[model samples]
Target: TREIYAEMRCIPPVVLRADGRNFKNTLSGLGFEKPYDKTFARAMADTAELFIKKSGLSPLFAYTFSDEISFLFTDLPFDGRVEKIDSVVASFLGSALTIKLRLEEPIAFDSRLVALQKEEIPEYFHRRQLEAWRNFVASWGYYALRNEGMGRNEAAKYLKRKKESEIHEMLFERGINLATLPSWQRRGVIISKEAREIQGFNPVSGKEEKSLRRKITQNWEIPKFKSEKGIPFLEKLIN
Candidate 1:
């Protein structure tokens, strides 16, 4: 009989990280433009929102950066068994994204469990957002170099010598102001809930009507750790 390899509980304020493989090669060929792809981005957000609504896991939040997704679960099933949690989260996201994008090739995501203090959630998300911003700038700068006839190898090696500000400046000099880029490029997509009034014809009454509805919305301008808007939304995600 197999003994416990290690005994641990999956605590609340849990984070499930799904790292998607074959992204750069796959998405690029699939008409996903580099540095930013609005259409692909929206598709990803849709998948996250769909998973949230249907998973029944009661996610506190979902943060998607590039092809990677992070889900904060406040409630769960299988008693938070590591194997089941990892399999379900990864498979659900992979399937949802594959369907949402209508992909011919399978989209695969593999999950890992992360433990964090409740207070650190905002900080964690801020770091991921900033990471996405850095990636955007680097992507533009690298591609710009390649556009100048440099080989992909040359561009990679050349950019390896750059600092963060140097990459920003490279893009800036090329008139690609990173600051002016879409918020989604810098902050990633955060799928969350919002209550909004919906106005539609009440078919039952055959009359116009308005009702408050809870909607899944995506936020591109995620605030920094200590910013005015950061904790407010982060708090809402906390169970």
Candidate 2:
């Protein structure tokens, strides 16, 4: 489906979760031992505001919970360009060295619980997950290249190769050749394991996988009035 942006309208409030991996460490190989605390959360929120401002979107409301951040775009103007949001988020999180953005598209309220069920996922979810992994890896590449003083066009080209290499490295490290794993499992395990390794943590062993699966869940609620109003206000300012 073609992406559409409501004109000068406030964006609905959206919540997002992250695994709280160190952003700077991932990109720069810096071993800074920054504690994940309220200070870090505030810094992230401040960075988000800067991102929204620079992206020409209004940041009227934002809150950060442990390893998660929820935000609303007021009068938000997207111009039907997804990359703008992607770039802004990547850049902002790039500064922290201890975070990554994990965006969740709003699923229908009624289906939220069903989506959380632990049945075998259909091909559509699998494909979407693969796409999400690619996007996350690409964001890392963009950050790395830009930090190394590359221009936008050059950085893009650099990121293309970098992302591919990282993907290959991840697959090779896992012992299962990319061709052997089912397409969805290949991508899923790569992301899950790589994220763990990046944080100096080992992959889950034994029944841990079952435990993790059991924890999977989602919440459902109507859009908050604040977010609904804010996105519109932002759109008017930008337009």
Candidate 3:
């Protein structure tokens, strides 16, 4: 008998924003000043590693922390095979860390909440996690960077600017616009359902009238844009 299972995904990226106000007031709070590239990178990497371990997820691919540490677990899903793992990951995250966790079934690389299964997530539960993450990051900004000496506004401005120019250049400069861009530039990361199922198995049975069968399929349609270069630019900057 061919077993049917739903794919589980857990791609955790931890971002720690420095507190602008605290840093401004004390200046002692600015732990790592400008030109400390190595320090900055290490901090990002450390936070990401901690988050991945805390989340109880086995590391899959490379963990990066330049401005933000994105831990991509290609094979494993933090939420175990049972789907109950979803809540577990969420709960664990709620108890630990100061970064926002955005959970979604990638219906389209850009858009979310398109299908019924995607909508099945409990609104209150998801909302609580979102709110909690927001508060955590805000407080984190105050303590980590602010305590060190970086003003909230200044820190945010610097981070945003760096992200737009340097970070964006690094990511796209390589071949990593898979999710958003078209055929021109190489694809970023193609997270597949089948790839996920290989790590663990969770059979979802549709009971007679109430079938547990849920399928989500999406095809990329090239936008009616003028040029291919414009595609990467639009995805990188616009959306």
Candidate 4:
């Protein structure tokens, strides 16, 4: 039946979206702040780097926002063995974040596969990016109420059961506009390789030398997901 599922895929550049379980409680237990925290974001980036390094398929790029991370593969693993790929990625990320956070509790992620054509790759990420913003706004609102001394139950219920506009109004009353926050908070992190000129002192000559180096960069200034800049950025990674 492996062949049966393989033939069902629609395109290349498949995505593996892994989301953490009990992460809200898990991160809270780890002393992570509500709404947004760089420490939590950095840990997610580290886990992404680890997964990409271990994945033999050699991913084209990875996008992570909050507790969710998505990998865009240039080549499918195990010839698109979806079950194996999902299990391996989820297990590896679970271990990496757990260790990175120095926690005793088990952290887990569940994954699903989405087949995307080369041309459609940008659109797919665009959708995820939209979802990230939606999440970001909701989180900020939820935490703001908490900071105001609302009980956990009421705080969770406020946003969980409110209309989308209500969340914005909740924040607006506090003079905190979702759009006014830093780019990194709203858009999340886009981790990818970029070539940069590195000027370093040569060990042999003790003189300055310039060379091009490729290194993973955490893109903090990502544009709005539906913008022209955002589309081109995703397309560049695919190319």
Looking at candidate 2, what is the lDDT of residue 5?
41
Give the true-structure RMSD of model 1: 2.5
Stretches of candidate 2 exceeding 4 Å from the true structure: 1-36, 52-55, 96-239
Q: What does candidate 4's lDDT look like per residue over 1-239, in tens digits? A: 75565443423578889998878775565666656778888889888887666655567778999889998887777777776788888888899888778887777899888877777777888888888878888788877888889987888777778887888888888888877787777787887767887899888998888865678777778877678776677767788
lDDT of 4 at 145: 89
Q: Evaluate residue 34 in candidate 3 and report its C-alpha lDDT on the 0 to 100 scale.
A: 39
Looking at candidate 1, the ten consecutive residues that score lowest on lDDT are 1-10
lDDT of 2 at 235: 40
Better of 2 and 4 by lDDT: 4
Q: Write the per-residue lDDT of candidate 2 for residues 175-200, one digit (tens) a residue.
A: 42444523222232110000121222
- What's the TM for model 2? 0.28
Give residue 228's lDDT in candidate 4 (0 to 100). 71
The TM-scores of all predictions, comma-separated, are 0.87, 0.28, 0.25, 0.85
Quickly count the clashes in candidate 1.
0
Best by lDDT: 4
What value does the lDDT take at residue 229 in candidate 4? 75
**In model 2, which range of ten residues has the least summed lDDT?**
105-114
